[PDB]
Design brief:
The PDB classes it as immune system. Keywords: light chain dimer, light chain amyloidosis, immunoglobulin fold, protein aggregation, immune system. The assembly is dimeric. The entry is titled "Crystal structure of cardiotoxic Bence-Jones light chain dimer H9". The structure is a homodimer. Chain A is mainly β. The first copy, chain A, has 2 domains: 110 residues, Immunoglobulins (Immunoglobulin-like), CATH 2.60.40.10; 101 residues, Immunoglobulins (Immunoglobulin-like, Sandwich). The first copy, chain A, is 5% helix and 46% strand. Chain A contains 2 helices and 18 strands. In chain A, the strands form 4 sheets. In chain A, strands 1, 3, 4, 7, 8 and 9 form a 6-stranded mixed beta sheet that branches. In chain A, strands 10, 11, 14, 15 and 16 form a 5-stranded antiparallel beta sheet that branches. Chain A has a 4-stranded antiparallel beta sheet with strand order 13-12-17-18, with no helix packed on it. The longest helix of chain A is centred in the last third of the chain and has 6 residues. The radius of gyration of chain A is 24 Å and the shape is elongated. In chain A, 36% of the residues are buried. Chains A and B meet through strand 7, strand 10, strand 11 and strand 16 of A and strand 10, strand 11 and strand 16 of B.
């Protein structure tokens, strides 16, 4: 039996948002065992409130928890991009039962546009010794999290051997991805250069690398 | 690092059994019979599946069993079913605070296992000229799509400046990710080496790179 949370809530940077967690007299209304967890997709939930109002060590004083009757509430003030996450409440009930809310996705509205930083790496000596010549185009610090990548061998398009990872949000709240091109040492040494062209929000960043002169 | 230690992953095929551990100290896991286990499917609420070491809440099948020996609690899932593929967490009371593990991803194998290809790249000449010395540890062609990365500066663990992408399925239906360490040129040039350690299916692969006079 789930506790009741709104599926979504939102706020702009620096604003406050309050989200609720409705249970029954025998769980939320029954004791001070209400906890709140903040979870970024693909990461473990982080405890932000326990015993209705208590913050663990390291949780900013911007997160406040309270309860009135059968409804617990979490308020997040001075919203920051890192606060954009899923929030789950829980409460013990009778008979060793532990109830969880269905989660609230809190959206921090209007986050700033950010162009990608692109760094193109030529093949490592270890992999060239291992008869491999992979290039990696590291793409970081971009927002929103959608990019397209094209590769060139000299000035010509590369139509095979390309993989680009699905962008993931990193600790600076901006996206990262890597495009990698698996070349043979012969393909790498036979061209004057390779280039990675990253398109983000209609603007392209191009980087070029060439076989070592060392 | 979480208060209790759980292995980052486990796997098995349908019908197999898996056992996952949760290690603490004598003041938490080994001090009482208060270990709880929680199951969580991506994008869904966690669910309590074991409490007080061995107790199953109503409706949790007997395929799930919990035990404890000294400072280590264990959860066994027998006859693995598709619905068991999830993240599993433990918790315990401590000397009367609550301590948690960092979670174990349990994968019900959907295709053959595949060990990752790990390629470690030193700083590129262009970024060094731009006063950056980012290293990239490319990890590809692995299954299950669960990986843990750690970096070392010489033999010392380095946590600061590390970012690792969430694994994503590539055109060959295997996973890829990259881990990048944002060093300054001073940090890069002043150490003997830097290493990328990739853990997958309980085994660790390490790659090391060191500065050169010419890039």
């Amino acid at each position: 039996s789930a506790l009741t949370q709104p599926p979504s809530a939102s706020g702009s940077p620096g604003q406050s948002v309050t989200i609720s967690c409705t249970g029954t007299s025998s769980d939320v209304g029954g004791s001070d065992s209400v906890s709140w967890y903040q979870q970024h997709p693909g990461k473990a939930p982080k405890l932000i409130i326990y015993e209705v109002s208590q913050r663990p060590s390291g949780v900013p004083n911007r997160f406040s928890g309270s309860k009135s009757g059968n409804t617990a509430s979490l308020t997040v003030s001075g919203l920051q991009a890192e606060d954009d996450a899923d929030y789950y409440c829980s409460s013990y009930g009778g008979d060793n039962n532990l109830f969880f809310g269905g989660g609230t996705k809190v959206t921090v509205l209007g986050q700033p546009k950010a162009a990608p930083s692109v760094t193109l790496f030529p093949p490592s000596s270890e992999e060239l010794q291992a008869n491999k010549a992979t290039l990696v185009c590291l793409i970081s610090d971009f927002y929103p999290g959608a990019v397209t990548v094209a590769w060139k061998a000299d000035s010509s398009p590369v139509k095979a051997g390309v993989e680009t990872t699905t962008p993931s949000k990193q600790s600076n709240n901006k996206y990262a991805a890597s495009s990698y091109l698996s070349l043979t040492p012969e393909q790498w040494k036979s061209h004057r250069s390779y280039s990675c062209q990253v398109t983000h929000e209609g603007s392209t960043v191009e980087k070029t690398v060439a076989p070592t002169e060392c």
